[PDB]
């Protein structure tokens, strides 16, 4: 029941969800290859708990928006995001997803927070694979409830808990 209502139990389940981040592959653009390189045999996102990679949205919690989110893919991704279990986290990978990138035009959503609740933002073009590990570590200590912004605020464990989805 939501991972709450005991001081030890919420710490425990937050620990589990933090290190057991099961990525949901959503490769969009050239960010995708520097995403996969965070799993190659120089630098693997295969230690923290993300070795296995369930392409299914019904089985993976972290959605890595790796590339430009073109508008014709937005509504589809929409349902794909709703086709995730509720304990889900959404990372915005790359400049084109986090921001509009250099493609300031009619074609691209200029910030993916519009359609999906973003957990962590990561600048870069392409973000070095180790920066992707840094972003998942950021998300790690966020879902543990150990993350603070520049204004001093603690951030909720799971973004996408605060939106009247519909």
């Amino acid at each position: 029941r939501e991972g709450i209502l005991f001081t030890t139990l919420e710490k425990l389940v937050a620990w589990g969800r933090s290190n057991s981040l099961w990525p949901a592959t959503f490769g969009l653009a050239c960010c995708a290859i520097e995403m996969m390189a965070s799993t190659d045999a120089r630098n693997d996102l295969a230690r923290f708990g993300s070795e296995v990679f369930r392409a299914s949205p019904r089985q993976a919690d972290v959605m890595i928006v790796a590339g430009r989110l073109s508008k014709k893919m937005a509504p589809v991704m929409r349902r794909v995001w709703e086709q995730m279990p509720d304990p889900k986290w959404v990372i915005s990978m790359g400049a084109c997803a986090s921001s509009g990138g250099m493609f300031n035009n009619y074609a691209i959503v200029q910030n993916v927070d519009s359609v999906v609740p973003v957990d962590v933002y990561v600048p870069g073009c392409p973000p070095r694979p180790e920066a992707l590990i840094y972003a998942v570590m950021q998300l790690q200590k966020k879902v543990r409830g150990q993350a603070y912004n520049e204004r001093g605020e603690r951030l909720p464990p799971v973004a996408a808990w605060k939106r009247t989805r519909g």
């Binding site: 490769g27 653009a29 050239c30 190659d40 430009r68 073109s70 589809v76 035009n105």
Partner: protein, 384 residues
């Protein structure tokens, strides 16, 4: 069964939608649906100075991008008649063949993983990292590197680039020969690839399937021989070909292309003699960074070039090149302004994809995956 292999699923690389008209386990015909990544490079490029568009060029075909860089550079140069020093051109062809190696590595890793086993994805992709390290040495960027310029290249090579490159040129032939020893005497991959993928050269031509799979159908049609631009006239060159268009001959040709590319790298690097790096014509190349504290004219040209840029003559231009996916070119219309009037890209994977309903027609449902991977599509190229 009008089955919807939807966008990005199941793990269909190169976000793409496929409406497989299919009864059973065969493949009647696949109706493709693309457009899921169209960002508008042909449009956004109309609003960036000639110097800036080099930042838009690589990010479209993000695997073999230096073909983009070089084609755009050559088109603009021919438009304004700039001279690339021989050392600059040689470095350009070295980087071209190197990104070709990286591209083919990623292509075969993705293909092998696509159906079958996962393991060999790593080793080949491993080399990519080393290759990327090489690039990170010179361009300071893994990919999307902003190095090339209209006159030539941004700046010089460090002393540290050549040794790492020689080390890789020593390990690569053994590595590629290992993959080929694994592959050529294929136990199942033989019964998986040799028969599949009917590529009648007449149809591959009618649909313009240039992406290296046409020579698997036995058409020796390569720009490196057909239309020498960057000194390929000066290279000892094997142009691999396939007897019958299938997956197996395609893959063998691509591997021999990798080895010959390594040989081209050796050849180019060996002939490397000191010299200049780009066309010093100030309208074409920004002033050298050292005399910014000496001349007014220096400040004027630097300021204007980095704010306005330069204005090439009124005219239209095109230059083709050979990408890891076939014939490429830029139709660039310049109106005498600091920004190009229009930039159209001949996207090789875009025309090459028309051969999917034909190719995967009658093949099996699983083989529809390999027959896509055999084509090596990059949807950043296609949707564009």
């Amino acid at each position: 069964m009008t089955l919807n292999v939807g966008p990005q699923h199941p793990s269909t690389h190169g976000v793409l939608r496929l409406m497989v008209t299919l009864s059973g386990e065969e493949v009647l015909e696949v109706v493709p649906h693309i457009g899921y990544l169209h960002t508008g490079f042909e449009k956004t490029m109309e609003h960036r100075t000639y110097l800036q568009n080099i930042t838009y060029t690589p990010r479209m075909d993000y695997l073999h991008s230096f073909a983009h860089d070089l084609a755009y550079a050559l088109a603009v140069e021919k438009l304004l008649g700039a001279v690339v020093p021989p050392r600059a051109e040689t470095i350009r062809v070295i980087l071209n063949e190197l990104s070709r190696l990286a591209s083919h590595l990623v292509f075969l890793g993705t293909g092998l993983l696509d159906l079958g086993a996962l393991t060999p994805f790593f080793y080949a992709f491993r080399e990519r990292e080393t290759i990327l390290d090489l690039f990170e040495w010179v361009t300071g960027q893994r990919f999307h590197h902003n190095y090339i310029r209209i006159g030539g290249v941004k700046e010089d090579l460090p002393e540290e680039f050549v040794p790492e490159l020689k080390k890789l040129l020593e390990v690569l032939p053994h590595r590629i020969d290992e993959y080929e020893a694994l592959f050529a005497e294929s136990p199942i991959f033989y019964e998986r690839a040799r028969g599949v993928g009917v590529i009648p050269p007449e149809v591959a031509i009618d649909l313009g399937l240039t992406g290296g799979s046409l020579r698997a159908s036995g058409v020796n049609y390569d720009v490196r021989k057909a239309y020498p631009y960057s000194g390929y006239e000066t290279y000892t060159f094997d142009v691999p070909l396939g007897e019958r268009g299938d997956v197996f001959d395609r893959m063998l040709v691509r591997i021999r292309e990798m080895r010959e590319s390594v040989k081209i790298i050796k050849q180019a690097l060996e002939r490397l003699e000191p010299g200049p790096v780009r066309d010093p014509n100030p309208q074409i190349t920004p002033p050298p960074r050292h005399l910014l504290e000496t001349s007014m004219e220096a400040v004027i040209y630097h300021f204007k070039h980095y704010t306005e840029g330069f204005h090439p003559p009124k005219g239209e231009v095109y230059v083709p090149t050979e990408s890891a996916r076939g014939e490429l070119g830029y139709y660039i219309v310049s109106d005498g302004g600091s920004m190009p009037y229009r930039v159209k890209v001949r996207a090789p994977s875009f025309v090459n994809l028309q051969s999917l309903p034909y190719a995967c027609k009658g093949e099996q449902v699983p083989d529809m995956v390999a027959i896509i991977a055999s084509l090596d599509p990059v949807m950043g190229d296609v949707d564009r």
